[PDB]
Design an enzyme around this catalytic site. Sequence first.
Site, PDB file in Angstrom:
ATOM      1  N   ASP A 189       6.929  -5.123  14.659  1.00  0.00           N
ATOM      2  CA  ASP A 189       5.971  -4.421  13.805  1.00  0.00           C
ATOM      3  C   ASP A 189       5.000  -3.567  14.627  1.00  0.00           C
ATOM      4  O   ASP A 189       4.387  -4.050  15.572  1.00  0.00           O
ATOM      5  CB  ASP A 189       5.183  -5.451  12.978  1.00  0.00           C
ATOM      6  N   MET A 231       0.797  -1.216   0.000  1.00  0.00           N
ATOM      7  CA  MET A 231       0.000   0.000   0.000  1.00  0.00           C
ATOM      8  C   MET A 231       0.840   1.282   0.000  1.00  0.00           C
ATOM      9  O   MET A 231       1.789   1.420   0.780  1.00  0.00           O
ATOM     10  CB  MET A 231      -0.928   0.005   1.213  1.00  0.00           C
ATOM     11  N   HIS A 256       7.857  -2.698  10.438  1.00  0.00           N
ATOM     12  CA  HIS A 256       7.265  -3.123   9.173  1.00  0.00           C
ATOM     13  C   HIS A 256       8.137  -2.890   7.945  1.00  0.00           C
ATOM     14  O   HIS A 256       8.555  -1.771   7.664  1.00  0.00           O
ATOM     15  CB  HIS A 256       5.909  -2.436   8.980  1.00  0.00           C
ATOM     16  N   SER A 307       3.940  -6.493   2.120  1.00  0.00           N
ATOM     17  CA  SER A 307       2.814  -6.019   2.905  1.00  0.00           C
ATOM     18  C   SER A 307       1.528  -6.590   2.286  1.00  0.00           C
ATOM     19  O   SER A 307       1.475  -7.793   2.000  1.00  0.00           O
ATOM     20  CB  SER A 307       2.817  -4.489   2.935  1.00  0.00           C
ATOM     21  N   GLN A 308       0.506  -5.768   2.059  1.00  0.00           N
ATOM     22  CA  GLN A 308      -0.736  -6.305   1.496  1.00  0.00           C
ATOM     23  C   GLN A 308      -0.495  -7.089   0.213  1.00  0.00           C
ATOM     24  O   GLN A 308      -1.322  -7.909  -0.178  1.00  0.00           O
ATOM     25  CB  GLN A 308      -1.778  -5.201   1.258  1.00  0.00           C
TER      26      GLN A 308
END
Length: 279
Positions: free
Chosen positions: A206, A14, A262, A88-89
């Site tokens: 994270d 994202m 992250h 990530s996503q």
Amino acid sequence: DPPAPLPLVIWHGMGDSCCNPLSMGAIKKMVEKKIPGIHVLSLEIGKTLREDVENSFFLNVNSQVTTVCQILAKDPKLQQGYNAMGFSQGGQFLRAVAQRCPSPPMVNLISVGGQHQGVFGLPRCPGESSHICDFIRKTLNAGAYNKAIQERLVQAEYWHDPIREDIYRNHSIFLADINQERGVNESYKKNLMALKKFVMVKFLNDTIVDPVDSEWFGFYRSGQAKETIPLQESTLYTQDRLGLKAMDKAGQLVFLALEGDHLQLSEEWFYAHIIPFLE
Ligand SMILES: *[C@H]1O[C@H](CO)[C@@H](O[C@@H]2O[C@H](CO)[C@@H](O)[C@H](O)[C@H]2NC(C)=O)[C@H](O)[C@H]1NC(C)=O
Ligand SMILES: *[C@@H]1O[C@H](CO)[C@@H](O)[C@H](O)[C@H]1NC(C)=O
Ligand SMILES: *[C@H]1O[C@H](CO)[C@@H](O)[C@H](O)[C@H]1NC(C)=O
């Protein structure tokens, strides 16, 4: 020859894009380095960089996935197999591609900080000792699951409310579908087990992903939002709606972790733990 260097497919996270020199572009060159001749395809959703970034926030995920499977099918160098790596996503997004479009065939799936069980909390807003942070997540449920919001908001598509899980099961158009929450889809199960290696990378410190266990296919225990359980103890594993128990038995699941926030990783780590799965 072609077999030695298996092509790599990348799906950014994202707010990022396909081709930025400092993020995915640097990944692309750090892979073409340690593996001479490899063909790397960094997915771009839309016609420009601007559409690609805004699409990471505002385009129906199911629609992005069908678009991606369309692209993977028109690329000749992929027809004999391909490794995939999502950030990530991008992680859960590539697992959906694996479950929905078996051809071309995905080989190794590398998930770097992906949220396989979704999220239930906001970045840097721990609910344990903060009342305001806790109210927000438990309240956006009316919003997150509103039909119009569900199809226009990417984040909403993997928002997973554990307190009211039935509302989550009946209204999520993405995460709930790929996680078999409304009955077992036979092809999704067979398609995922068809992968050779499913590598899940979890960032131990994270602060962005809540709960962090989602990175290893874990999540908050049903009914509440404080204690969490690992993949093994969850119903998804127990009943094998995805084939995860079988795959784990066969050694197809790899659980990796490292300290840091992250998507915070060193070249040292990237060369010592990820490259081996791409070569
Ligand atoms: C940053 O956070 C991670 C994850 O919490 C730490 O890793 C371990 O976390 C558990 C859970 O709190 C602790 O019991 C361990 O003590 C942590 N590992 C270690 C080093 O013992 C990680 O250590 C933390 N790193 C920092 C910022 O010091
Ligand atoms: C299951 O997934 C396939 C795509 O992989 C889809 O065509 C089908 O309609 C889905 N539902 C079931 C269980 O048939
Ligand atoms: C969603 O659908 C299920 C299907 O059995 C229904 O029983 C339930 O009342 C619905 N849940 C909510 C809260 O929307």
